[PDB]
């Protein structure tokens, strides 16, 4: 899979205006959603060469596990009885199924009109046996838990498979969750592409959205190095 | 509504402009009177002419502010259901069943 | 783009007032006929400016202007009465 995207941001106060704009532009109001991601890295206690059976260089990378959680797990008592809609974001045995992903650093190129990232994904449906916890399974693969973050936001479905997410991110630790996006929302526009044509067509869709928001909110290509999960 | 208030204000401004025009006319004719040696209208000539300028100045202050309010309202009050159909028919249906 | 409307409107106001007073100065003061023609010109320009104000106002105005069980029971009746299957 190839994910083409553009990012942006707005401060908490820009919320309502942005929601109103995206609602008119797309024709639909926002849809609330969340996801928990846990990132894993090769066990540092174990050490293996970084080469193939064909003696070809392999770069060590992180594995990302992601799933959803019922919203009720994110609403405490103070949050109680508050319209379960877009406005809520302001006031902020076996294993379960998971999405397993390994991504590559975005495609190189000066003057790229969008970010383009390859993503290898498979789906974990269930487990059984002695150590069936997703954690044990990751260890069995030779990986260890590194960090994890929660993301809550609203999304918009647009034409040609374009999706827009307005998100807030919180890292999770016993010491406490800290909001990586403290201050506002991370804006993301993207399309997932399973032929050159559809790639240039997808770029166009993103470019038209960028064009349509120019003046109001700017969408740009983030730094490749900021989208590289390789271990080092 | 708010838009109705804005439109009403604009209409009021139009009225003001009209007034300005009328008193422009008055001013002209009465200036014609003053040049002929009738000074009795000097109070009325200048009054209508001054009331014109005052009315025009008031309209200018009112109109310029209204334009500013429009610019400030961009994104706020101003842009930059089939479930309803169903309830109609169900209402209609239960009404047929129980007249 | 609205700032342009503000600028045009302000310029129009200044033009209107200035032209009014200045025309008022121009008369009182075929030279006389020429002066009359000039007066006609100024006045006409002023009127056109009024129409311009009207255009602006119109522009602004245009800117402003531009359960389940109940259903299951109800359908149960509807379908029954409609087939007339009872027939007994």
């Amino acid at each position: 899979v190839q994910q083409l995207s553009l990012f942006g941001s707005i401060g908490d106060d820009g919320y309502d205006l942005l929601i109103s704009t995206l609602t008119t532009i797309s024709g639909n109001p926002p849809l609330l959603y969340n996801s928990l991601c846990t990132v894993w890295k090769p066990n540092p206690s174990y050490d293996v060469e970084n080469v193939n059976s064909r003696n070809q260089l392999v770069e060590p990378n992180r594995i990302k596990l992601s799933k959803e959680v019922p919203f009720s797990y994110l609403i405490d008592e103070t949050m109680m009885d508050k319209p379960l809609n877009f406005r809520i974001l302001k006031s902020f045995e076996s294993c379960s199924p998971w999405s397993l992903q390994i991504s590559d650093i975005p495609a190189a190129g000066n003057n790229r009109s969008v970010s383009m990232q390859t993503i290898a994904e498979t789906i974990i449906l269930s487990s059984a046996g002695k150590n069936s916890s997703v954690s044990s399974l990751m260890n069995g693969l030779g990986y260890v838990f590194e960090f994890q973050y929660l993301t809550i936001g609203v999304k918009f479905f647009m034409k040609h498979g374009l999706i827009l997410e307005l998100q807030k991110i919180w890292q999770i630790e016993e010491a406490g969750n800290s909001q990586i996006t403290s201050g506002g929302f991370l804006l993301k526009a993207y399309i997932n592409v399973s032929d050159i044509d559809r790639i240039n067509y997808t770029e166009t869709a993103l470019m038209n959205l960028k064009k349509e928001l120019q003046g109001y909110i700017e969408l740009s290509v983030p730094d490749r190095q900021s989208m590289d999960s390789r271990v080092a | 509504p708010y838009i109705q208030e804005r439109l009403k204000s604009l209409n009021d401004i139009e009225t003001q402009l009209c007034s300005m025009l009328q008193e422009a006319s008055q001013v002209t004719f009465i200036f014609g009177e003053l040049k002929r040696g009738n000074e009795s209208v000097k109070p009325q000539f200048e009054n209508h002419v001054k009331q014109f300028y005052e009315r025009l100045d008031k309209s200018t202050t009112q109109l310029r502010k209204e334009i500013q309010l429009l610019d400030e309202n961009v994104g706020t009050r101003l842009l930059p259901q089939d479930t309803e159909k169903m309830e109609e028919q169900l209402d209609l249906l239960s009404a047929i069943l129980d007249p | 783009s609205n700032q342009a409307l503000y600028e045009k409107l302000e310029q129009t106001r200044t033009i209107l007032s200035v032209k009014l007073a200045e025309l008022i100065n121009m008369t009182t003061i075929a030279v006389a006929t020429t002066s009359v023609m000039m007066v006609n010109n100024q006045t006409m320009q002023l009127i056109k400016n009024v129409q311009d104000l009207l255009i602006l106002t119109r522009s602004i105005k245009e800117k402003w202007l531009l359960d389940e069980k109940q259903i299951e029971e109800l359908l149960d009746n509807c379908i029954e009465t409609f087939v007339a299957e009872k027939t007994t």
Binding site: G11, C37, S103, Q171, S178, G183, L186, M227 | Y53 | -
Partner: peptide, 20 residues
């Protein structure tokens, strides 16, 4: 009578590598 939030790249970098 009249008068004439945060750094997008940094946020992303965290989600991909965990660094704050």
């Amino acid at each position: 009578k009249h008068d004439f939030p945060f750094n997008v790249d940094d946020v992303l970098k965290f989600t991909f590598t965990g660094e704050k």
